[PDB]
């Protein structure tokens, strides 16, 4: 057996299974080879930045991952040394986790992995009827379903959530339960366990709070039980709460604007109240405004502590939370400057006020029609302008310092004024009024016209072509983006909910099968779906 | 028949035809089944925001 730091733990049984030699496997198991050896070398670990073969480190996992069912049945059933179906690796991944890891969302891989998963579950039920493999979590606390949801494996997820077995002695492993069928319509029940209420890590939490790299982040919500769940939750209670929140935010911004507009103009804050109506209403509005700022501040901190987003994806996701938090920061800095007796609180207040209105666009998310504008603004700012700033500032600074150096004595003799005027030229509102008497006028004109041609004509339209391409990229994807935002809203409304109830269930705690492997019956919170399909 | 508000009016002849059982259809017609009963439950009526079979 290999003893190095690269192939640590690899042994002959792995080579026999890997080579697909039934005879050598039978002989090795006969001679007392260890059927639960851990090949955990760096070649065998789960990793992206190094070539390797991760299979779950175990011969049973290797057999399952390589599409060799006969060897699996041999290892599990053979009496020389039977293999434990529920063994786990150093990552804690069992055979089912290993099977999830080797998916790649292709047709043939889906067929292989779905088949092997189904067969292993049936065999596991037969060998250990009291064993529940699907509830075993790996080291990260993920069940195989949660791992599939996080990884974006659409095929495995679609199979599991719509799983049905028409066979006694393993029917309790089904999740989809067809109750009837008519011509185009059929009514079925869906198991729903650990979709909504798992208390540790549900499927919807995993899909919603994924890190935007997941290959099928938005297609996963089209899988039928999830889509029906989100539609039911939306229509049932969440929609009203969302509209109420939007209305309350509108009232808050109206009060804030009215209070801000009527600030006193006298020097040296803070200002003392006179026994007059306008002062009472103004101070009331101020208190409400600062209250709203403090509320959004603590909501922002709670979000960041709960999610723990990384710096690399801090802005790629969580754009809206960052903007609401920055609004809160400007409000608090304004309060600090206010009671510190400085006029400069006006400056801080003003920025928050401006932000307060544009954050209203957050509420157009979740509309099929309107959310595309918020999404387009986000992507344009985060990609195109942030990349383009380096190029444009190189041009601006180059010609700016050139012109400042050339010119002595005038309005174009300081960095500030010349940078502002060159920026004006770039957005097409300059003057070009070459009417001043100064030396080197020809070179000045050549520089300025070169700048105009380079930035106004060329670079600006380069930027516009790129932004237009970005918009046409996501003209098509509106339907999925809408659903994903709706899902995030539904979960966020579920979490707080401000009533002490957690009525997050759909249909009754119905008896699903009634016939466990033991004499008990299973009640499982099934959810009814009446589907229609006009095929044939 | 179904006497509830959802499958109102469905009877054995409709089930026989739906299952594509020619023999059972022949038998039910022979035995005096009503070949003009109206299956007018909400499952069977025209509707938009609900699955059904009109
Ligand atoms: C934190 C960031 C990244 C940000 C905060 C401020 C300064 C911001 O400018 C930027 C940089 C900027 C400034 C000027 C022009 C373009 C970009 O982009 C946003 C930020 C960007 C915007 C414009 O973006 C929007 O359309 C708001 C918005 C879009 C999509 C949403 O989902 C959303 O939900 C909250 C809000 C509004 C400002 O916050 C605003 O009102 C002021 C005064 C400046 C805008 O800095
Ligand atoms: C789209 C791609 C193709 C674009 C091609 C760009 C064509 C732009 C042509 C603009 C030419 C404008 C010249 C300015 C004239 C001027 O303002 O006058 C000039 C000032 O001198 C100069 O700057 C030299 C000429 C500048 C060299 C310029 C390439 C001569 O002297 P006067 O001041 O006495 O003129 C006395 C009259 N008041
Ligand atoms: C309207 N007088 C000049 C404007 O200030 C502006 O610079 C110009 O019209 C735009 O470049 C053309 O739309």
Q: What is the DSSP letter of A188?
A: E
Distance A316 CA to ligand 1 centre (A): 14
* Dihedral sign (CA A52, A56, A57, A60): negative
Which pairs with CB-CB distance under 8 Å and at least 24 residues apart come from B15-23? Answer: B18/A182, B18/A183
Residue A174: how many CB atoms within 10 A of its CB?
18
Closest-CA residue in chain B for A531? Answer: B51
Cα–Cα distance measured from residue A393 to residue A461, given in angstroms and rounded to the nearest whole number = 16
Q: What is the resolution of this structure in A?
A: 3.3
B9: left (phi over 0), alpha (psi -120 to 50) or beta: left
Question: Dmax over Cα atoms in chain B, in whole Å?
Answer: 39
Token look-up 């997050």 returns: A504
Residue A36: how many CB atoms within 10 A of its CB?
15
Distance A471 CA to ligand 1 centre (A): 18
Instruction: Determine what percent of chain A falls in helix, strand and coil, rounding each to the nearest 5.
Output: 55, 5, 40
Instruction: Determine what percent of chain B falls in helix, strand and coil, rounding each to the nearest 5.
Output: 30, 0, 70
Give strand pairing partners of A188: A178, A529
Q: How was this structure determined?
A: cryo-EM
A34: left (phi over 0), alpha (psi -120 to 50) or beta: beta
Q: Which of A182, A532, A533 to mutate to test the interface with B (most CBs of B within 10 A)?
A: A182
Beta-carbon contacts of residue A447 (< 8 Å; ≥ 6 apart): A399, A402, A403, A406
Which pairs with CB-CB distance under 8 Å and at least 24 residues apart come from A160-163? Answer: A161/A190, A161/A195, A161/A223, A161/A224, A161/A225, A161/A226, A162/A223, A162/A224, A162/A225, A163/A118
List chain A residues with CB under 8 Å of B53: 182-185
Contact A273, A264 (CB under 8 A): no
Closest by CA to A445, choosing from A412, A471, A490, A488, is A412
Contact B54, B41 (CB under 8 A): no
Closest-CA residue in chain A for B20? Answer: A183
Cα–Cα distance measured from residue B28 to residue B11, given in angstroms and rounded to the nearest whole number = 11
With CB atoms and an 8 Å threshold, state whether A185 touches B43.
yes
List chain B residues with CB under 8 Å of A531: 51
List chain A residues with CB under 8 Å of B47: none
Cα–Cα distance measured from residue A386 to residue A392, given in angstroms and rounded to the nearest whole number = 10
CA dihedral A289, A290, A295, A297 (to 10 degrees): 120
Contact A72, A82 (CB under 8 A): no
Query: Residue B2, annotated ligand binder?
Result: no
Cα–Cα distance measured from residue A71 to residue A91, given in angstroms and rounded to the nearest whole number = 23
Give strand pairing partners of A531: A186
Contact A64, A95 (CB under 8 A): yes
């Amino acid at each position: 057996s290999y003893t190095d730091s690269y192939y640590k733990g690899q042994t002959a049984l792995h080579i026999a299974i890997e080579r697909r030699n039934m005879t050598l496997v039978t002989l090795l198991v006969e001679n007392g080879a260890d059927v639960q050896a851990a090949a955990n070398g760096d070649f065998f670990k789960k990793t992206k930045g190094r070539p390797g073969f991760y299979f779950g480190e175990l011969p049973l996992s290797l057999a399952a991952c390589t599409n060799q069912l006969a060897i699996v049945k041999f290892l599990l059933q053979n009496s020389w040394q039977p293999a434990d179906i529920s063994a786990r690796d150093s990552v804690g991944n069992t055979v089912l986790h290993a099977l999830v890891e080797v998916a790649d969302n292709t047709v043939d891989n889906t067929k292989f992995v779905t088949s092997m998963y189904n067969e292993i579950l049936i065999l596991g039920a037969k060998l250990h009827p009291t064993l529940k493999l699907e509830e075993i979590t790996n080291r990260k606390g993920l069940t195989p379903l949660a791992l599939a949801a996080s990884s974006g494996k659409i095929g495995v997820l679609a199979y599991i959530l719509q799983r049905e077995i028409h066979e006694p002695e393993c029917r309790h492993l089904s999740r989809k339960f067809t109750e009837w069928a008519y011509g185009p319509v059929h009514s079925s029940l869906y198991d729903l366990s650990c979709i909504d209420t798992c208390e540790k890590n549900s499927v919807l939490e995993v899909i919603a709070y994924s890190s935007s790299e997941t290959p099928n982040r938005h297609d996963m919500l089209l899988v039928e039980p999830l889509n029906r769940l989100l539609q039911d939750k939306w229509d049932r209670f969440v929609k009203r709460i969302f509209y109420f929140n939007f209305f309350v935010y509108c009232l808050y911004m109206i009060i804030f604007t009215a209070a801000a507009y009527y600030r006193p103009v006298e020097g040296l804050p803070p200002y003392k109240l006179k026994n007059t109506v306008g002062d009472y209403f103004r101070v009331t509005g101020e208190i409400l405004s600062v209250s709203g700022g403090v509320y959004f501040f603590f909501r922002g901190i709670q979000y960041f502590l709960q999610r723990r987003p990384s710096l690399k994806s801090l802005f790629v996701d969580s754009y809206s939370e960052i903007l609401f938090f920055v609004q809160s920061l400007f409000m608090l800095v304004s309060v600090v400057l206010y009671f510190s007796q400085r006029k400069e609180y006006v400056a801080s207040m003003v920025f928050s006020l401006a932000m307060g209105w544009t954050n209203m666009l957050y509420y157009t998310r979740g509309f099929q029609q309107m959310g595309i504008y918020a999404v387009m603004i986000e992507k344009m700012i985060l990609r195109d302008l942030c990349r383009f700033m380096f190029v444009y500032l190189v041009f601006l600074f180059g010609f700016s310092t050139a012109v400042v150096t050339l010119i002595e004595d005038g309005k174009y003799n300081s960095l500030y004024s010349t940078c502002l005027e060159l920026f004006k030229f770039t957005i097409g509102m300059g003057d070009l009024e070459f009417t001043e008497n100064y030396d080197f006028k020809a070179v000045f004109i050549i520089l300025l016209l070169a700048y105009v041609i380079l930035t106004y004509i060329l670079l600006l339209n380069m930027l516009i072509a790129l932004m237009g391409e970005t918009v046409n990229k996501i003209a098509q994807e509106s339907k999925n983006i809408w659903k994903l935002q709706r899902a995030i809203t539904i979960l966020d409304t579920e979490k707080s909910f401000l009533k002490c109830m957690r009525k997050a269930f759909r249909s009754g705690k119905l008896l699903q099968v009634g016939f466990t492997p033991d004499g008990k019956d299973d009640y499982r919170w099934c959810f009814r779906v009446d589907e229609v399909n006009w095929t044939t």
